């Protein structure tokens, strides 16, 4: 049931490529004739042993996951000579929130942005409550089903907290909270910056040349070395640099923004209280 066989998964077009994995839309059509279930297939770019035990236990996570605004497991797929394993997931027609908001824009109002704000919201309280770090928080990586529901749709980077310690210790530069750069501790708080850098570039509707990439950039200086750009956006960070408040974005939301942009870890906002804010200041909007 979980299980999916090799010779009936047919190949349609590449979806993209991701931290070491690429994703395809594939047809899944035992009686051949093309009306099986579109899907969309993950697997290893390149396969090695160790990002195989990685894979499977994204896998294990996804596989654990229920939730209205988390991309569905479908099942597996183990190639023959085992050179592959395929995650088999349920597929969103529209592509990530990056590109979807890239080119519909003008019929997307702050309203719609913050229907998708608190589903993000959800979706991170949840998995919270798992224990998992998502690590990897941004539009590119959350997925349009239609135009009432996003979902967080990877989770190549996600980990498990210990039992007791709250923090993980072992990429996105521009989305990472500060104790993550210097100290490499993902948790729960880390995440919750993130996700104010989300907030951000909802509110950009991606522009290009407004992607905090971008921004952050355009504070660091085109002219910076190497490894020499990280530090200095820890430098900008430790003294509260921080992006802009987008073109037309009212000051309520990006009051979170910095909120969650925060050097201190526990003055950050769970997403348990994100989550009822912003669905407050929906209300409110009545035009
Ligand atoms: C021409 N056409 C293309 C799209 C469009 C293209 C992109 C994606 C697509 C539909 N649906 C998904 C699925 C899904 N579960 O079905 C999972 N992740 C994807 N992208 C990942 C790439 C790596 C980074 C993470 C996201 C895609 C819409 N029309």
């Given amino acids: 049931p979980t299980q999916f066989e090799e010779r009936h998964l047919k190949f349609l077009q590449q979806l993209g490529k991701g931290n070491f994995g690429s994703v395809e839309m594939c047809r899944y059509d035992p009686l051949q004739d093309n009306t099986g279930e579109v899907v969309a297939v993950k697997k290893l770019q390149h396969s090695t042993e160790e990002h195989l035990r990685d894979f499977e236990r994204e896998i294990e ?3 654990s996951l229920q939730h209205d605004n988390i991309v569905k497991y479908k099942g597996v797929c183990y190639s023959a000579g085992r050179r592959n394993l395929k995650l088999i997931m349920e597929y969103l027609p529209y592509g ?11 019929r997307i109002d702050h309203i719609k942005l913050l229907q998708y704000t608190s589903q993000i919201c959800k979706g991170m309280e949840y998995l919270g409550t798992k224990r998992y770090i998502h690590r990897d928080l941004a539009t590119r990586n959350i997925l349009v089903e ?28 521009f989305w990472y909270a500060p104790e993550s750069l210097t100290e490499s501790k993902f948790s729960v708080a880390s995440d919750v910056w993130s996700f ?4 951000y570039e909802l509110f950009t509707y991606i522009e290009k040349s407004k992607s905090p990439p971008a921004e952050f950039m355009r504070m660091i200086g085109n002219d910076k070395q190497g490894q020499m750009i990280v530090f200095h956006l820890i430098e900008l960070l430790k003294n509260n640099g921080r992006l802009p ?3 037309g974005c009212p000051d309520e939301i990006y009051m979170i923004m910095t909120e969650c942009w ?15 804010r912003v669905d407050q200041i929906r ?5």
């Avoid at 529901?149 to 530069?173: A, C, M, N, W």
């Avoid at 104010?196 to 907030?199: A, N, P």
């Fill in 61 to 63: 996570i996804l596989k």
């Fill in 196 to 199: 104010g850098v989300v907030l």
């Fill in 283 to 287: 209300d409110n909007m009545a035009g």
């Fill in 146 to 173: 239609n135009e009432n529901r996003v979902k967080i749709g990877d989770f190549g980077l996600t980990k498990v907290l210990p039992q007791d310690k709250e923090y993980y210790k072992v990429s996105p530069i």
């Fill in 262 to 276: 925060n050097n201190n870890v526990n003055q950050r906002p769970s997403f348990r209280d994100l989550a009822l």
């Fill in 245 to 247: 408040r987008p073109d």
């Fill in 96 to 106: 990530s929130l990056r590109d979807y908001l890239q080119k519909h824009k003008e």
